[PDB]
Symmetry: D3
Subunit: 230 residues, 6 copies
């Protein structure tokens, strides 16, 4: 149906969970979904559709970086009529009070990318997670009573950032963690009147040197439950 998706309208649930690693999406589909069916594997993206507690739910990879997720997200909302996209994955901690294995729920994401300025007449577009999704994720976390930090994330275009002072600058402003897609996902959802959100498990701290499964499983519980609530 699209240059990056062989599936047809209806093959995807209205709620899709996405992570960068296609093998993680495969794992997620085999571990948490019932009767997972491979609906798209163009570029080995591992797009599946199954059910969770009886409700349709899809999981698919989105690659690394804003340009990548921008391709997948826009096609999902536009062609497959998806309504909600929840980004699930790992991230690097920025804030000194954020530790490895911590779970973070993004209220929004800053970025050093030019994509949003291109879409917003060179002005400041606040890549903001859909309030419904942020609420669904936080309520799920509260109901499951799983500690989670809510706040700003940063989507960098440079995993290996030349601007070494940026890290401390973000710490001063209390950005929670760094990843590479949220800032791109959020504005696309707005344009399509759809919804998006993001939750990550800190797998490393960029300001200093500091089991990882429990944290990842807890994050998945939150995303899945929130998905049902939505």
């Amino acid at each position: 149906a699209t240059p990056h998706n062989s599936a047809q309208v209806g093959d995807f649930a209205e709620t899709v969970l996405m992570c960068g690693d296609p093998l993680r999406a495969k794992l997620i589909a085999e571990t948490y979904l019932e009767n997972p069916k491979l609906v798209n594997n163009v570029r080995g993206i591992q797009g599946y559709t199954g059910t969770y507690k009886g409700k349709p739910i899809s999981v698919m990879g989105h690659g690394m970086g804003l340009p990548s997720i921008c391709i997948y997200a826009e096609e999902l909302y536009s062609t497959y009529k998806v309504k909600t996209i929840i980004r699930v994955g790992t991230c690097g901690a920025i804030d000194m009070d954020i530790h490895t294995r911590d779970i973070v729920i993004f209220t929004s994401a800053g970025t050093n990318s030019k994509i949003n300025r291109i879409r917003f007449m060179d002005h400041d577009y606040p890549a903001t997670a859909s309030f419904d999704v942020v609420c669904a994720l936080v309520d799920a976390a509260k109901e499951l009573n799983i500690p989670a930090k809510v706040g700003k994330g940063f989507s960098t275009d440079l995993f290996y950032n030349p601007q070494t002072e940026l890290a401390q600058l973000m710490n001063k402003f209390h950005f929670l963690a760094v990843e590479m897609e949220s800032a791109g996902l959020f504005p696309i959802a707005d344009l399509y009147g759809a919804r998006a959100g993001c939750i990550c498990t800190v797998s490393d701290h960029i300001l200093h040197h500091e089991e990882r499964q429990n944290s990842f499983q807890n994050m998945m519980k939150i995303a899945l439950e929130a998905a049902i609530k939505l």
Copy 2:
């Protein structure tokens, strides 16, 4: 104590409500606060401190524009040790589904100002309302059962915008309304590890032509109650 505030540390409550119009802040202090005392009137800013349901609460004007509120907000957090600043006021509707008299709670604010790029190494800083404040405002609205729209706002540097296409662009991305301070307030709160939020009553629609007291009073109820919850 500061170039724009004659008050001394302790004269202001840890929670301050702010609006652009100094006469509105005076009105608010005389109408909703008990035993309001003028604590600062440099530049006729009308800074008062009284109590609401027994709790200390201050109200003060902040002028129009990011540069103005940036002066007042930074001094309040830094010198007067204020913890929470809730911006209350009017705004212009952008989204076609947003109507005059509607109450809007900002999740974040975009801007055409250069201030955040100056503070954030020329990158995209998501001027995000503190999640605690957004929640306090929304819960108050739910408890008072007062319809309110939650979403993105836009803080313009140009009330009379030369870029006439921006209005429709923001409508496509579903920005709710336009004002002139939020985008400046939010990042300052982050820097001081403090909190900030914003709630406005739509007093006009910028995309077409379309009582105003009830809406303003309801907005004040929400802000005041949320202030107590915080």
Copy 3:
């Protein structure tokens, strides 16, 4: 007549003196104008109209920052058919040869704001004081034989500037002082084929630590006389 002005066309003189502090404008009106009449007090802006040496002259506040003065100035030229706006006020010295209490007449103003780039297709617009006004102010100063420095000013969006190196950079280029409106005022006057200028009394030096009435009164004499000459 406008969202920020209750006065009607004709209530304002063709020449208006403006300062940030509304209480200063009130003081100016009661101290230097004959039969001052309050013509506008929306947002407590203190807009008056009286006479000086028999000629009509208005004085009104304009708040702090380019966005604020941009609102007031554009409405004055456009709706109230004002012809000349002379900004009078205080400023911070930059140049090491400029001292506190010195009077400065702006030839132009630089800025770290994005407003002029928005109006000028992202290019460099030289916020220049109207040559007639600069001349009127300088001749008045010469005739009153009051020492005054003529040169570049800087209109910052950030009173509390994070970029601490900017101060010395401006000293190297010999910017005289810093304020927060001139750079916004000047281009608006050009657009309306009207005139604008600015004169300030240095109330503090930003590069080091260093009666204030005489300087302020002398500055007012210059502005008033120049107003008559125009």
Copy 4:
């Protein structure tokens, strides 16, 4: 050894061919390499190392977008001591004289990304293919007598570009085709004193509507032979 590569120094040849699609890299390894061994499959990237005409050669996916390839390329040069990276893949034609199935060899690549400005103090960095690689690709094409167009490419951050006028602008300047990695690859090679180049087969035209295997196989012949020449 790295967050995205499980292989160890020595597992990769000094010359690596890369394409966005991991399944294409798998296909390439099974079709053109002798004794291909999977050396890295983190995130299903399909990194292989085999031999072509007796010489060591690796093939691996790099995902879509500058941020993605920037991660893989920098790790290859820095950690695995790779010397040459030749990007092989598909692209969209821009120039009206460029047709679908045409083979294009990039001399350089323009971009709407902010990555190079971040690495180059906000100036214009010419993402240029290594002259040795451009020559090796062109000589191979000449020796194999396979028609190929040499010229500028464009690496977009937005596959679905909102700026619809850009396409015709690039046509006027004669950009040959569009892809999403070259502009990111080239500067990284320069920084590591290494080499990089790109060759693509046009799979579609963005300015109008206009077998695909022959073109892809011919492109692979050129890349492989050039790899040997280097």
Copy 5:
């Protein structure tokens, strides 16, 4: 002494008149100066030094564009200890009320160049003519009773401007004329605590189609006399 000047300190007068055309500078030296001596001809720049009414005065070409004049001006202030540089030449009219053959005295100059942003931490630097020079030029014009328009000029990097809407934009803001050096000259003078100014004779109108000697001679009279006054 410098890469572009063979003269030695002292060969140039403290006041130098400059124009783009080296042949015009030669003409000026032979027509208005007494005992003109060629002091520099590197790159055929035609740098002369003679006397006018007994006072030392130099005339030299400066090429076309900000980068060119920036080279010559900085060397003159820095190495040859020049104090005043008055740019004399031709320009294109912008304002509809400005006609061919009109003489224009620049108060300042806007630009689409990046040079000033590079020198001014990416902010808006107002390329302003030295007030002493502007005054000297205007007084000379008044004393010689030669009609001259005083106002903003624009220094473009593109004589053949692709942005065809800029012309009308500048007309709306009342820029008087266009040339290619002033915006570069002015900031350099500031840095060296020296002085600079510009006066031009409109040789063509860019907004419509509309003897040239008288205008040029009158402009030279103004510059020369002003030079003496300084």
Copy 6:
């Protein structure tokens, strides 16, 4: 025929060699061309047309800086129907492995100018030398067996660069040398479907302190021979 060229269509050969110094172009015409005829001397630009090995060839100055060469190059392609422009001249070495007297052939040129962003919707345009010209220059060098380095150049707007860190940054990325026109020349050739290239002899090193005729003559041999090959 044009504001900067008195010659008429046909007076210039389809291949023009250009250098900044007009006296160097005169020297080149008298030293390497047979029967050189002055075809244009507006602004003393020294435009000649003669023959080399029986083929028509023109040589003309282009001044210093992108704005200057942009004027001359665009008029040559557009009005005089020139097909190839080869920039010949001197440059400053950047790379530590590049030494004075070395000959450099530009593959492309980076720049700190805003011209290309203005022509390319504020994106990154890779100022790339025409591949035919780069090849002609390199083959000539190989056939004449004259050592020459091929790589990136940088066209600065500031000969006296305030950003002193840029030099080392470019060294890290291996820019070969610095000049002031290439980045402007290349994009203009693309727009006119014509060709351009550049070759320079390093006359100085900007990173340290380190006969000059042989190098200049060898560079001229390469340019001339390449001109014939084209």
